[PDB]
Structure formats: structure tokens, C-alpha cells
Design a protein around this nucleic acid. Structure first.
Lengths: 79, 99, 1351
DNA sequence: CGCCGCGTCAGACTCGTAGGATTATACGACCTTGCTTAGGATAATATTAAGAAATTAATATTTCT
DNA sequence: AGAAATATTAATTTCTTAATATTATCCTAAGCAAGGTCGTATAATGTGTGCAGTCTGACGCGGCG
């Protein structure tokens, strides 16, 4: 979270992998513009990414599946 | 003393003011070792390319910050291919084996 | 854009033309009035591009529209000005010249290829003597020098039939004329036929060079320059300074010379000059090109008008100031400020103060973007105006942009990774950064002017890294050892110590309190003193099975202060942690217990709470320091006068001649040391407990409340030594040569020193101060060498599936158990299944992480030797695995894949050193504890005196316990009387072996007669015959102390019976003949037969000086360099039987003949070595023959890899442990791994016979070739040990190798090798600005690996 | 076999940082070059008719309101 | 009368061509100061770096017996 990221590390299992996943999600929320899954609570997108990973709402597989779902739906909207 | 952006040196194209805004903080070898120790590859990469030498990188990333997008498009530092020119001028053919 | 590898080769002249955009034809730079680039000159705009963006010189084509066009009036191309910085030129040399790098290198490459002594080449090149390029005549051969008159003669006989030339034209003809296949095959075929070692290595050089040139694609001719490239002008700027003066890079001057001289030559060849003048011109042209390429390597360095030498091309890519070390590995950086630091004691561990002005200047583009977004400034130009005006909305935007934005604080020197930590800013009104006190220790920061650099992580990944990897609350455990580095340092520890202490009778003595809360209420109300013994009910919690905290309440017998402090302690910890004096050690250990029981978050909160309450109660105390707090012992004057009288007496015993000068010295220094220790004891008895306190009316002495004693006792600041200098006499000083000044400084700082006492003190003061100044540079060099060795080692797997590794046992050096098993095993992973004292009882399926629970479990049992997977024995090829490493010490768990352990280890080893670089009788075996006895490395016989004889020098005494845990190891000398034997139940306080401290004896193992043979009088001794009792002045000494008279006199004594013939040592037929060692006295003369165990030769030893072992930093540097150890302890290279051969040709011959093996192997050993082995004796491989330091190379070659790694780990550890510095062993093990990286091949069928190879390449080959590809056509290897600097230079990547040392040599080698590096090490990727393959960049770089897999 | 004495080259790291290397120096005379006057012929090029017609914005009915 | 819709003069853009006068390229001839080379006839015929303070330790390596 804000002070310690231990819970996120136990949820992913690797400091480095946690950084990569959290950066991907924060990029989604900062540029991609999509809404957070936890309340804002006046935090920078980085910390919302960490908080979401703390609750198990965001895992690398979850990010992959959401991205694939949206991309396949756009490809369906092509036709 | 502080610095966000200012003068840049002539040959190496790397931070060095001094008149009003002085040169940036030197990020020496020992600190590169410290970041390698932490495993922080992205902080290192930005402290090598877009904060110091990468010209297209430095300006593009100032633009990105002003837009509110925090992202890096890093290239190759100026000092590296200055080194390539200086080695090439010793009659030694050093290149970059492209893909 | 993306490339993969970097290739170096030699630049063909056609290729140098290919780079170039036009020939430079003139030495003209710019015009003198217009200051515009001149045609064909060094700065020409036609060649190197236009001077302004999209403008020709003549301004005809002067806008973007006309880009790409070449203005016909001036020839310039309308393009960006940046191409002045990328376009190169070329000077067409009017005569080929030699490339100095490929000629004046220490291993000349032109001289190797041609096989012509460098002197002969220098003679040909300097136009000093001809050489035969080629001769049809037979008397003259190729590469045969023909001096001038000899050339004239040879021309006279034949003339055209032989071609002989002078200079670089000749050398180019020679290089061009040789055929590489033919010399390759000839050298290969004639290497084997006459395989002399020096000739073999020379031919190996020649051959490897020839295949290098065959395979690389280079050609030899390209050594010789005929077209010389010219650097782009922006890289050698000529720019106007303010005053109107210009500033030019020295290359211009150097370049000018070349062109000038080149042009002159182009003219002389037209005027058909006398060839003496043309020769001189060619000499100067060669000299000018050489000064261009490398001014230094050129015998005389060309200096400019400054008179200091010009900086050549090679001087810019080389050295500390070169591109590599100064602008390519470490750069200046934007978004970074710095300032003085101060304490923020109100801070939390993850917070740093940050001045408002500094944060405004650092975060400026963020503010611009935010102001534009809020609409407060729809214009960046007006946003700058608002930021400069400093409106009150700028500050709100700043506090909004700085929230949750970590910022890295740095302090130089950055000795270890905890020197750059990411805090989270708090904006403060000031100009000094505010640092949390608890994080000073990691920074080594103190607030007396230190300054810290502030760096802003910009991108989003950088922000998450600084929050998740570097945040100050993640780094609470050191990465070197596992101990915490959030230790409450000095004021907080005195506060805790003052509050958790006690008194005999104070306010509130023995009342009962209902808990900690009314303890606090009583203290605040002023009804009870902070430390007054009391009964309080407390309800402590305990994490039982399933991690549930069970509440148990009781009525503890504590003080008020400890009850108050219990309120800050987290649930899960016992009250015992608070029911004590709580010095520094106790506080750090209670933080350890909090971390181990609860985790990271409660530990961070607990550390902050400890800091606040320690500061608060330290301030409530009123702790000062007065001149009355330093109490001189009331009995110091008499001690001083007693020592004065004693030195007067010893003076009278010196004048009377009774004592010598050297003996007076040691005795008087001893009595001064004794008086010093008595005064130290007197003061520490007058301090530590002098407080007499009333209890029920009667006195009761307790521990003192002296300010200085408390500051020394809590561990806050100082120690008994400094207190000793404050109140007791400050001991003896040393002269600037190490000689302890005879008389000591008898005064102290409370009385003040005399003039001489102060002057004497100054010698040591400046010695220590200059030592500290010059000790940091050595430590920095050691850290640098270690890092460059260990760079590219990263955890790369999860389990190599390896078999067992190292065997781990406590280091017990005699009485002291230097290091126990729990500290040598904690965190590692078991090499294989470990069994309890009851056999076949296992806790581990061959590998389990030994954490605190398992360490306690195996301390329940008596196991004292565990097999542990170790890095040196990993099966992983391009790195290590996550098991063979063990525990990530800082994070406290198994180590994450992709971490950079090499840099961690290098910094852990190199961080200390900056802070601690640096009677003797040995009577007998005084066992200190009860236990059994076990003897090792001795094969003796029971004597006639009831004891055991001593067959060999390796008598290892091992004290055991009743629990089977060895507690003492000794080494009794060969021939030292030993009282008891083996298996006895021996209690302590006894001597089990016997010898005087000045006696290293050697004993007859049977009744022995003296036979006067080979101790022959006249040639080694002088006969001074004494009585029938068997006395004399005979002194027998080792080979190192034998005169030149005794060549056929072997120093010994043949042990024979009363019958006369050789009596035998019990158990042998080889005659009893103990060749008695050095410094030995023997008295028995002919007609004497003594007991079976009565001494011949005793070796007195006094061990005077007590400083005879190297240590500190140079010892560790020497260990890691793996240097030769002066005279080495020779080992037994092959197991077998050894005898002697040719006598003292200068060296004896030791012929080692196995029971069944290579019998004719022998060795030559000088006349300085006393052989523990006898004339002929059967010995095992890797056994001591002569004595001295062990060369590690031999240890690896003869003993196992585990043996040499154990040797190195133990030696360097001992050096550290001596200074009270603890460093987990994994670090030394990984550096030892990086030493043992190369192998020299034994067999063949895969590659060459013996040449150096990477052992990972050989293991991969055997894992490919000696698998089902072939039964065995593979090649075995000899594992090689290599010094750190050599190993770091023997890197397969020429950018990493070229980065740090011998840049010129490495680059020259890479050029003639036609090498390429694929950018795998961290350094390589730091240089080219990529993502390092460690940590966070690992996931990226493995993507590139998989894409390399599929094309 | 075992030295042994020649060069030889990088020696850890962050901050600012004034003054800096003399000597002793010919006149014409073409010849060319690199930049300036200069002198009208056109060539843009800014303005002026012009009118005419077209709204188009006012003027003045006159019809509701 | 107070707007509330209508017919008239009347003030006014808008093109348009021609036009009409001004004005500004242009371009080549020529000119002048600046920059480059040659030519000098009493006799003259070999050197300055003007030193350099043993760093330095291995270490390569070429010898070197």
C-alpha cells in the first residue's frame, strides 16, 4: 500500500514481478483512462495499482484476460 | 541547489550548467552499482538515457511529463555513439549488428 | 533501431573510404574574419555538413523547403546541423604508416604475425635498415635485415634478383605476402615434433594468432594505415569563448600536423627530392600519425603551446577521465538537487523533509502539466510565469503533485545499496533536507555538514521501483549479514536505558499498579519515579500453534519505566524483552524478535515508536556531562609512584649490569602496562558501582547513575577505552615507527597533558588520521575490482537439481568457538537429507530452507555438521540457481529469481574495510573444559614411558563433550611430550601435552645411541667435548640454516641400540633417523644412550614482537588476487612413496613413486626447506612436505574445490571477524565461484589440447558431446583458479573488459580477434543504455532471449 | 628450470576551482579573388478607376393598430 | 400616435479590368581592397627539447643463463 508493499508481494510472489504488474495497471489507469477497481481515496495511480493488487483484484493473468476480452470484443465490433 | 532542466555540455550532450542553474548531480559508478543491487532496472535506464544523454529522449519525455503521461521512450545515449565515432577514428571498425 | 550485438574488426581502407563523406585536403580550420568553415579544411561544410539548420554556406538554398539539395555554388547539403557530429572524413596518406596500437602493444601483433623481433621492426619502420621482402637468390632469405652498406653490397652482386625495402612499405609488403594457411599448418605440424615448453607456448601464440586472422575475416595488411579517418567536427569543437578567444579540442592540432606533413610528402614525391629528405618526411609522418592515435605510447609525447602534452585519440576513450569510466558508466543527471541534511525527529521511517524551493525546482514540468490541466494556466508560457511569480496556487499544485511521489536520497560515497534509499517527501520551510534519525546509520550520515543528493524518479515504472524496491521501510535488514540496520543509535538508546533502569529506594517503592497505564499516570503526576521497583499487572500475548495470540495476564515484578515502555511494544512479544537495563544490544535484539515473530509492518511501526519514546525520555532525564562526572581514582597517585620506583629499581639493575638494554625495555614496558591496567581497574571500580544508596536506613551499593558511565554502559557513545583516557591515565603511545615510547602518558584529559605528552600524542593522532585518509582509496579499489569480477552473476533458476555441496561445521580455533553452526547455516538449504543422533531419522527431503525454526530444532539435537548447497558447486551454467544460493538476507526469504547477487556480494565485502582495516609463550595444552579426547592426522606408537610418541607434525587434538560437539582443536608439534591418550574422560584445567614455551622438541621414539656420522665436526659444527654425562655445545639446524661446509653432512642423528646397529622406531624397518629440525640443541656425545622418549633436539621459541602476521585490507586484497605467498608450503602432488636423488646441486631431488602409478615423477626443492617427510616415506596426495603459506592454486589443483573455497572463506572471514565485522559467507562463496571460472583442457576430440576455456562451455560440451552424440570424444579439464583482476580481464565480452582496466590492450586484442559481444552482462547493458538483465529488467531481457530463439 | 631485469599502465569517490608558456620578425609586384557600386529593363505590385449592380442601409410613406 | 409594414433614394461592398503609376528585382559590367606567390645573390654549413626527480607494483616478457 502506501507505506509497505508486503501484502502485494505475497499476492504476486516477487518484488520485480509486482513492480511490472503494478506499472502496467497504473499505465492503464493513467493513460488508458479506465476506472479503478478500488476507491480513489485521493491517491496517485501507482498507489491505486498497488492497493488493487493487495486485494487480489489485479493479477497478471487477470490483466491478460481483461485485455484479451476487450480486444476480442473490438475485433467482433469490426464485423 | 536544484535542477529540473538547463544547460547541456557540448561534446557529450550531458547536464552541465553552473552560471545560474548548476550542472546536475553526478550519478557515479557506485550509485549505478547500488541500483543494480536493488534490481531497479527502470530507474537506472532513465538515469542513463532520458535524464542525461538521450536527446530525442530527454525532450520527448519532458513533453510526456507536461502532458501528464509518465512514460519513457529511450534511445541510445550520446556518449555511446560518440565513443563509437572515437573508436572508429582509430581505424577500428566497431559497429552494431542490427537485426 | 534495435540491434543485438557489437562487433569489432579491422578497418579495411575501402571501409574507411566507405564511412567517409569526403577527403580532407587542407589544414585550414575556419576563416579569421568571417569565422566560417573553409573548403576542404578540417571543418569543411561540404564534407561534414552544414553549420546551421537547413542552410548552405552561401545562403542560396536557405529553408526547410530546399532540404536534401546540394547547393551547387558551395557544395553544401541542406540538412540538419547535427550531422556535423556523425559525418567523418578521411586523409589519403601519401605513404602507408604503421598503426601504433598494433605495433607498440606489449604483445606486438605485427611482430607476432611476421615473427620478427620488435627491435627489427622499429629499425625498418624508422628508416634505419632495409629488410628482404623477397629474394629469388638463395643466400638472402625473406625477413632478413640488410643494413645500408650491406644492402649496397648485396645490390652489387645481384641487384634485381632480391627485393629489399625500408619502412612501412616494406612491412606492408611482408604482411601482405605471407600466406596464413601455410604458416598455420607448418607451425601446427612442427609444434608437436619438438615440444619444448617455452617453444610450445611461443608456437601456441603464433598459431592462435594465425587462426584468429583466418577465421575473423581480417587481413594482415590492414595493420598498416593508408587511409586515415577523421573525426566529425562537433566531437573536436572549435568554439568561441566569451572573451572573443576560441577553444579547440587538441585533436585539431594533432590532425593539423598529419595533414601538413602529409601534404609536404605529396610535394616531395613531385620534386624528386634527395631520398634522405623523403626518408625524413616519412619518419615525421609516421611520428605524427602515431602521436595522433596515442601520444603517450609514442616514445616522445608531442606537447602544445601550453607545454603540457596533447590529448590523443586513445587518451579520450581510456582512463578514469575517459569516455568509459566518466561519461558512459556514470553520468550527470537532470532532476536532481542536493543540500545539507538535518534531523527530522518527528518523521516516520518512510519520510524525508524536502525544502519547498528545491521541490518546486525539481518537480517543475510536473507542475506545468498540472497547471495546464486544472486550467489555472491554459498556456505553458504563462504557467512558467505563474511558477516564477510563485502564486499561492502553485504551492497547492505542488502539494498535489508531490503526494505519493517517492524521491531517492543519496549520500556519497555510496558504499552499499542501502546508501541510496527512496523516501516520500514532506515539504518543509527551509533549505536543508530533513532525514529520519534511524536511517542515518545505513547512510553513515551524521549532521556536521554532510550533504545529500535528491533524485526524482520520473517514469511510472521508476516510481513503482522506488516504492517497492528502495522504499526506506523495505530496507530494514542488512544485505551483508541479516542483522537489522534500523538500530536505534545513540540518543534514543540512552533514553531507553535511562527509562528501563532501577534504583534501591525511590518514589513509589513497591506499590502495586493495575497495569502500564497507571504506571504512566503515576510518573506524570510526579508520584513515582521513572525507575522505582514496583509490581504491575500485565497481560502479555504469545503466538501459539496456528499463529493465534493467546492472552495471558500476570503480576510482574518490574519498574515504573519498564511498565511505561511496555505500552509501545507490539502484541506477540514477551515482557522479558522489556524487563532489563535495555542497552544498545538489547534494543537491536528486541527489534530482531519483533521482525521474526510479527513481520515487517509491526517492526516499522515499532521502530518509530521506540525512536519517539527514547527521544522523549532522554530529554526528560537532563543527561549532561560535567567536569565532576570524570572521577580520577583516589588511588592513582600511588600507582604512578609505585611504577616510578619500579623503573628506578630496574635502572639500578641495568647500571649494575644485571639486565641488558633489550631486557630492561620489555620489563619496563611490562611494568608500565601493569600499572596502566591497575589504574583502569581502579577507575572502573570507582565508576560502575560507586553509588551507595540507603535502603531501610542502610547502605546498598548499586550500578551508578554517573552521566559518563551511563553513556558508556548503555552503548550510546564511547567505551571503557575512551573513559579510561578521560579519567585514568591514557596509557603508552607509539613513536612514528611503531616503537612503544618507553614512558607512557601518565596524565589524562581531566588534568590535561604536558607539552611533551601532547607532542607525543600528536604522532599517533597524525598516524591514524593519514592512515584513515589513505585507507579509503585502497578499499575503493578493492570494491571496484570485486564488482567488476562479480558483475554478471544473477540468480537464473529455481533448482539446478544438483547433488551435495559444501560441508558446514563451526569454526572452533582452540578454546574460542569463533563462529557457531546456527550462524553458519541459518538460511542456507541442506545439500542432502540430514539425520538426527538417532540414525535414519530425517527432517529434510534432501533440501529445506534452514530458518530460525529449523535452527532451533537442530540445536535441540546435537548435530554439528550439516551439508549445505553452496554457490561454488552450482550446476547452473550462465549463473546460479535459487537454491544453491539460499536466503535473500535483506528480504529474509528464499531469493527471488533474477536478482543481482554479484554486486550484492562485492558491496557487502567492500563496504567494511573503510571502517576497520586494522607474552606469546604458548606453554602447553591447557584444556579449558571437561570432555573426551580424539586425535587426528597422527599415526604413532605407544612408548616405553607410558605415553604416546609423536610420529608427525599434524597431531590434531580434538576435545569432545558428553553431547558430541567438539569444543577445542589444537595442533601439538611433532615431538612434544603428550601426557594422556585417546578416549579418556578428561576434565579441564589440565595439561595433556608437555613442552616448555621455549621448547618445540623432537623426541627419540626408542632408546637411542649417538653415532658421530654426518654431524661431522669441522664442516657444520666445532667440537667442544664435555663429560661422560653427555653434554656439548652441539647445535643442529635445518637446511635453511646449514653452512656451506656441510654438503655431504646430512643433519640428523642415527638412532641405534646398544648393539650398535640401527635400532628401529617401533613398527618400521627403515632405520630410526630423525633429521632434527632447525634451532635445535643436542648435547649427547659418543658413549651415551638415553631413554625411549628422552629428547634430542628442543626448539626454543619466544614469539617476540607479537606482530608477525599480515592482516587488514592488504591481506584480503592478497587473498582475492590469489597471489604467490613468498615461500610456499610444498604439498605432495601425487600419493606414493618418496625418496631422495641428486644431492644439493642447489636443490635436492624428491622422487615420488606411487605403489602402482607414475613412478619416475620427481621434484626439485631448495636447501631452505626442512622436510617433515623423511628420506623415504609413503605419503598421500595433497599433504604438507615443506611448511609456509599455502599457494591457493596448489590447494585447488591437489585438494578439492570445496577445499580451496573453504580455505579462502575461512582466511578472509578470520580477517573480518578479528575486527568485529560480520559478513555472511555466501558473498565470499560467490566471489570464489567467479574466480574458478576458467579451465585448461586435458584431453581432446572436441577442442584444442590445453588452451584456456570457460568451464561452463566445457561442461555444456560434455553435456552435449559426451552425451549420446559420442561415447567419449569429449575433453576433460583441469579446474583453474584465477585472481580477481585477471579473471575480470579474462572476460568474454570486450566492452566489459575494456571498460575498467587496460582499455588499449583489451581493444587491440578484440580487433585482432574479430570478436563480438552479445550484451549479456550488466555493465554491457548499462553502457548502451539498455535494461540490465537483473531485477526488473530480467523479464524484459528474457523476452529478447525467446525472440532470439525464433529468429 | 628458474629466475631476472627491461618497460609499463591504470591506479575510488561527490562537490567548486583563479591564472596560465618569451625568443624575433622586409618590400615590391603581379595575379587573383571576394566584396562592393551602378544602371536601366523589366516585373511585380500596390493603388485607382468605374461602374454597375447589388445589396443594403437608411429615409420617407401609409396603412394598420 | 405609436408602431408596423412597405417603396424610395442613398450610402456601400464587390469584382474587374486596366491601368497606371510606383517600385523593386536582376544581372552584369566594372572597381577596389584583401589575400597568395615569387623574387631577392657579401658571407653565412649540425641540436635543442634545455631536461630529470627513481611512484608503483606486479607483471609481461624477452631474455638469460
Amino acid at each position: 500500500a502506501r507505506v509497505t508493499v508486503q501484502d502485494a508481494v505475497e499476492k504476486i510472489g516477487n518484488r520485480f514481478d509486482l513492480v511490472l504488474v503494478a506499472a502496467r495497471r497504473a499505465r492503464q489507469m493513467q493513460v488508458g483512462g479506465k476506472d479503478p477497481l478500488v476507491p480513489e481515496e485521493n491517491d496517485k495511480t501507482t498507489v491505486i495499482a498497488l492497493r488493487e493488487i493487495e486485494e487480489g483484484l489485479i493479477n497478471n493473468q487477470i490483466l491478460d484476460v481483461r485485455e484479451r476480452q476487450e480486444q476480442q470484443e473490438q475485433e467482433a465490433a469490426e464485423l | 541547489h536544484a535542477r529540473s532542466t538547463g544547460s547541456y555540455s557540448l561534446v557529450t550532450q550531458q547536464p552541465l550548467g553552473g552560471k545560474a542553474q548548476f550542472g546536475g548531480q553526478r550519478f557515479g559508478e557506485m550509485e549505478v552499482w547500488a541500483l543494480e543491487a536493488y534490481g531497479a532496472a527502470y530507474t537506472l535506464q532513465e538515469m542513463l538515457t532520458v535524464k542525461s544523454d538521450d536527446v530525442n529522449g530527454r525532450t520527448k519525455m519532458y513533453k510526456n511529463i507536461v502532458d501528464g503521461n509518465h512514460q519513457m521512450e529511450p534511445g541510445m545515449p550520446e556518449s555511446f555513439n560518440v565513443l563509437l565515432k572515437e573508436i572508429r577514428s582509430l581505424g577500428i571498425n566497431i559497429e552494431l549488428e542490427d537485426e | 533501431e534495435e540491434f543485438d550485438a557489437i562487433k569489432i574488426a579491422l578497418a579495411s581502407p575501402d571501409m574507411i573510404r566507405s564511412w567517409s563523406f569526403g577527403e580532407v585536403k587542407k589544414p585550414e580550420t575556419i576563416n579569421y574574419r568571417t569565422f566560417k568553415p573553409e573548403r576542404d579544411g578540417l571543418f569543411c561544410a561540404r564534407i561534414f555538413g552544414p553549420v546551421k539548420d537547413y542552410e548552405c554556406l552561401c545562403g542560396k538554398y536557405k529553408r526547410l523547403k530546399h532540404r536534401g539539395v546540394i547547393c551547387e555554388k558551395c557544395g553544401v547539403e541542406v540538412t540538419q546541423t547535427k550531422v556535423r557530429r556523425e559525418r567523418m572524413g578521411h586523409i589519403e596518406l601519401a605513404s602507408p604508416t604503421a598503426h601504433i596500437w598494433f605495433l607498440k602493444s606489449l604483445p606486438s601483433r605485427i611482430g607476432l604475425l611476421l615473427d620478427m623481433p620488435l627491435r627489427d621492426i622499429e629499425r625498418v619502420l624508422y628508416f634505419e635498415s632495409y629488410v628482404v621482402i623477397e629474394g629469388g637468390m638463395t643466400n638472402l632469405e625473406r625477413q632478413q635485415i640488410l643494413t645500408e652498406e650491406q644492402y649496397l653490397d648485396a645490390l652489387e652482386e645481384f641487384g634485381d634478383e632480391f627485393d629489399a625495402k625500408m619502412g612501412a612499405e616494406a612491412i606492408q609488403a611482408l604482411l601482405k605476402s605471407m600466406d596464413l594457411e601455410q604458416e598455420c599448418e607448418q607451425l601446427r605440424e612442427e609444434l608437436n615434433e619438438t615440444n619444448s615448453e617455452t617453444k610450445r607456448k611461443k608456437l601456441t601464440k603464433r598459431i592462435k594468432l594465425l587462426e584468429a586472422f583466418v577465421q575473423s575475416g581480417n587481413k594482415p595488411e590492414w595493420m598498416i594505415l593508408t587511409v586515415l579517418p577523421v573525426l566529425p567536427p562537433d566531437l573536436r569543437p572549435l568554439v568561441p569563448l566569451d572573451g572573443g578567444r576560441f577553444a579547440t579540442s587538441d585533436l585539431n592540432d594533432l590532425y593539423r600536423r598529419v595533414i601538413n606533413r602529409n601534404n609536404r610528402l605529396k610535394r616531395l614525391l613531385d620534386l624528386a627530392a634527395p631520398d634522405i629528405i623523403v626518408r625524413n618526411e616519412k619518419r615525421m609522418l609516421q611520428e605524427a600519425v602515431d602521436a595522433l592515435l596515442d601520444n603517450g605510447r609514442r616514445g616522445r609525447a608531442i606537447t602544445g603551446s601550453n607545454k603540457r602534452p596533447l590529448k590523443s585519440l586513445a587518451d579520450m576513450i581510456k582512463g578514469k577521465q575517459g569516455r568509459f569510466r566518466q561519461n558512459l558508466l556514470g553520468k550527470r543527471v537532470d532532476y536532481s538537487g542536493r543540500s545539507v541534511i538535518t534531523v527530522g525527529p518527528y518523521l516516520r521511517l518512510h519520510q524525508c523533509g524536502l525544502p519547498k524551493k528545491m521541490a518546486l525546482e525539481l518537480f517543475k514540468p510536473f507542475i506545468y502539466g498540472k497547471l495546464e490541466l486544472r486550467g489555472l494556466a491554459t498556456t505553458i508560457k504563462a504557467a512558467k510565469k505563474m511558477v516564477e511569480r510563485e502564486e499561492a496556487v502553485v504551492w497547492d499544485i505542488l502539494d498535489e503533485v508531490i503526494r505519493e511521489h517517492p524521491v531517492l536520497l543519496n549520500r556519497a560515497p555510496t558504499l552499499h545499496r542501502l546508501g541510496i534509499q527512496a523516501f516520500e517527501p514532506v515539504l518543509i520551510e527551509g533549505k536543508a533536507i530533513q532525514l529520519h534519525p534511524l536511517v542515518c546509520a545505513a547512510y553513515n550520515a551524521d549532521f556536521d555538514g554532510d550533504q545529500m543528493a535528491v533524485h526524482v524518479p520520473l517514469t511510472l515504472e521508476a516510481q513503482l521501483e522506488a516504492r517497492a524496491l528502495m522504499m526506506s521501510t523495505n530496507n530494514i535488514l542488512s544485505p551483508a549479514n541479516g542483522e537489522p540496520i534500523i538500530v536505534p543509535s545513540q540518543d534514543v538508546v540512552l533514553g531507553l536505558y535511562y527509562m528501563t533502569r532501577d534504583c534501591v529506594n525511590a518514589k513509589g517503592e513497591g506499590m502495586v499498579l493495575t497495569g502500564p497505564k497507571e504506571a504512566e499516570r503515576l510518573y506524570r503526576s510526579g508520584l513515582a519515579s521513572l525507575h522505582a521497583r514496583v509490581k504491575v499487572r500485565i497481560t502479555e500475548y504469545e503466538k501459539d500453534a496456528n499463529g493465534e495470540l493467546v492472552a495471558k495476564t500476570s503480576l510482574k515484578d518490574t519498574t515504573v519505566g519498564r511498565a511505561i515502555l511496555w505500552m509501545i511494544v507490539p502484541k506477540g512479544l514477551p515482557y522479558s524483552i522489556v524487563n532489563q537495563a535495555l542497552g544498545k544490544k538489547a534494543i537491536s535484539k528486541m527489534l530482531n524478535t519483533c521482525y521474526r515473530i510479527l513481520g515487517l509492518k509491526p517492526t516499522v511501526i515499532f521502530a518509530d515508536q521506540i525512536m519517539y519514546t527514547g527521544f522523549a525520555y532522554a530529554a526528560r532525564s537532563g543527561a549532561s556531562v560535567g567536569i565532576d562526572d570524570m572521577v580520577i581514582p583516589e588511588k592513582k597517585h600511588e600507582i604512578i609512584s609505585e611504577a616510578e620506583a619500579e623503573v628506578a629499581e630496574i635502572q639500578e639493575q641495568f647500571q649494575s649490569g644485571l639486565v641488558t638494554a633489550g631486557e630492561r625495555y620489555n620489563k619496563v614496558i611490562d611494568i608500565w602496562a601493569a600499572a596502566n591496567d591497575r589504574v583502569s581497574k581502579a577507575m572502573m571500580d570507582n565508576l560502575q558501582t560507586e553509588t551507595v544508596i540507603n535502603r531501610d536506613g542502610q547502605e546498598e551499593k548499586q550500578v551508578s547513575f554517573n552521566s559518563i558511565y551511563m553513556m558508556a554502559d548503555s552503548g550510546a557513545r564511547g567505551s571503557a577505552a575512551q573513559i579510561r583516557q578521560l579519567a585514568g591515565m591514557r596509557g603508552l603511545m607509539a613513536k612514528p615507527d611503531g616503537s612503544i615510547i618507553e614512558t607512557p602518558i601518565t596524565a589524562n584529559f581531566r588534568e590535561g597533558l604536558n607539552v611533551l605528552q601532547y607532542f607525543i600524542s600528536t604522532h599517533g593522532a597524525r598516524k591514524g588520521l593519514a592512515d584513515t585518509a589513505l585507507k579509503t582509496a585502497n578499499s575503493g579499489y578493492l570494491t571496484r575490482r570485486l564488482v567488476d569480477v562479480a558483475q554478471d552473476l544473477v540468480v537464473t533458476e529455481d533448482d539446478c537439481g544438483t547433488h551435495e555441496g559444501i560441508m558446514m561445521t563451526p569454526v572452533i580455533e582452540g578454546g574460542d568457538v569463533k563462529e557457531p553452526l546456527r550462524d553458519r547455516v541459518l538460511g542456507r538449504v541442506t545439500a542432502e537429507d540430514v539425520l538426527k543422533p538417532g540414525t535414519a531419522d530425517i527432517l529434510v527431503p534432501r533440501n529445506t530452507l534452514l530458518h530460525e525454526q529449523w535452527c532451533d530444532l537442530l540445536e535441540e539435537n546435537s548435530v554439528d555438521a550439516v551439508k549445505v548447497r553452496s554457490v561454488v558447486s552450482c550446476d547452473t551454467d550462465f549463473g546460479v540457481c535459487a537454491h544453491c544460493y539460499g536466503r535473500d538476507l535483506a528480504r529474509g526469504h528464499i531469493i527471488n529469481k533474477g536478482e543481482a547477487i554479484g554486486v550484492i556480494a562485492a558491496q557487502s565485502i567492500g563496504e567494511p574495510g573503510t571502517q576497520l582495516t586494522m607474552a606469546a609463550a604458548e606453554s602447553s595444552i591447557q584444556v579449558k573444559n571437561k570432555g573426551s579426547i580424539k586425535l587426528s592426522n597422527v599415526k604413532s606408537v605407544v612408548n616405553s614411558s607410558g605415553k604416546l610418541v609423536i610420529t608427525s607434525r599434524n597431531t590434531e587434538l580434538k576435545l569432545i563433550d558428553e553431547f558430541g560437539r567438539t569444543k577445542e582443536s589444537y595442533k601439538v608439534p611433532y615431538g612434544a611430550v603428550l601426557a594422556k591418550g585417546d578416549g579418556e574422560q578428561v576434565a579441564g584445567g589440565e595439561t595433556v601435552a608437555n613442552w616448555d614455551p621455549h621448547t618445540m622438541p623432537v623426541i627419540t621414539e626408542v632408546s637411542g645411541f649417538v653415532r658421530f656420522t654426518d654431524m661431522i665436526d669441522g664442516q657444520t659444527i666445532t667440537r667442544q667435548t664435555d663429560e661422560l654425562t653427555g653434554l656439548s655445545s652441539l647445535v643442529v639446524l635445518d637446511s635453511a640454516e646449514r653452512t656451506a661446509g656441510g654438503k655431504d653432512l646430512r643433519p640428523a642423528l642415527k638412532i641405534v641400540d646398544a648393539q650398535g646397529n640401527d635400532v628401529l622406531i617401533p613398527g618400521t624397518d627403515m632405520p630410526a633417523q630423525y633429521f632434527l629440525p632447525g634451532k635445535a640443541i643436542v648435547q649427547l656425545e659418543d658413549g651415551v644412550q638415553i631413554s625411549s622418549g628422552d629428547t634430542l633436539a628442543r626448539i626454543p621459541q619466544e614469539s617476540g614482537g607479537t606482530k608477525d602476521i599480515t592482516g587488514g585490507l592488504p591481506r584480503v586484497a592478497d587473498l582475492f588476487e590469489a597471489r604467490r605467498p613468498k615461500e610456499p608450503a610444498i604439498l605432495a602432488e601425487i600419493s606414493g612413496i618418496v625418496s631422495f636423488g641428486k644431492e644439493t646441486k642447489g636443490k635436492r631431488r624428491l622422487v615420488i613413486t606411487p605403489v602402482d602409478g607414475s613412478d619416475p615423477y620427481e621434484e626439485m626443492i631448495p636447501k631452505w626447506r626442512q622436510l617433515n617427510v623423511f628420506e623415504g616415506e609413503r605419503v598421500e596426495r595433497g599433504d604438507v612436505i615443506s611448511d609456509g603459506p599455502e599457494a591457493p592454486h596448489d590447494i585447488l589443483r591437489l585438494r578439492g574445490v570445496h577445499a580451496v573455497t573453504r580455505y579462502i572463506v575461512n582466511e578472509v572471514q578470520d580477517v573480518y571477524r578479528l575486527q568485529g565485522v560480520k559478513i555472511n559467507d555466501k558473498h565470499i562463496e560467490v566471489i570464489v565461484r567467479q574466480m574458478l571460472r576458467k579451465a585448461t583442457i586435458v584431453n581432446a576430440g572436441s577442442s584444442d589440447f590445453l588452451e584456456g576455456e570457460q568451464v561452463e562451455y566445457s561442461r555444456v560440451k560434455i553435456a552435449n558431446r559426451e552425451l549420446e552424440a559420442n561415447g567419449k570424444v569429449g575433453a576433460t579439464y583441469s579446474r583453474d583458479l584465477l585472481g580477481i583482476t585477471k579473471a575480470s580481464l579474462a572476460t568474454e565480452s570486450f566492452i566489459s573488459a575494456a571498460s575498467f582496466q587496460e582499455t588499449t590492450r583489451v581493444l587491440t586484442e578484440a580487433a585482432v580477434a574479430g570478436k563480438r559481444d552479445e550484451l549479456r552482462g550488466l555493465k554491457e547493458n548499462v553502457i548502451v543504455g539498455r535494461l540490465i538483465p537483473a531485477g526488473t529488467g530480467y523479464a524484459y531481457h528474457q523476452d529478447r532471449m525467446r525472440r532470439r530463439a525464433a529468429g
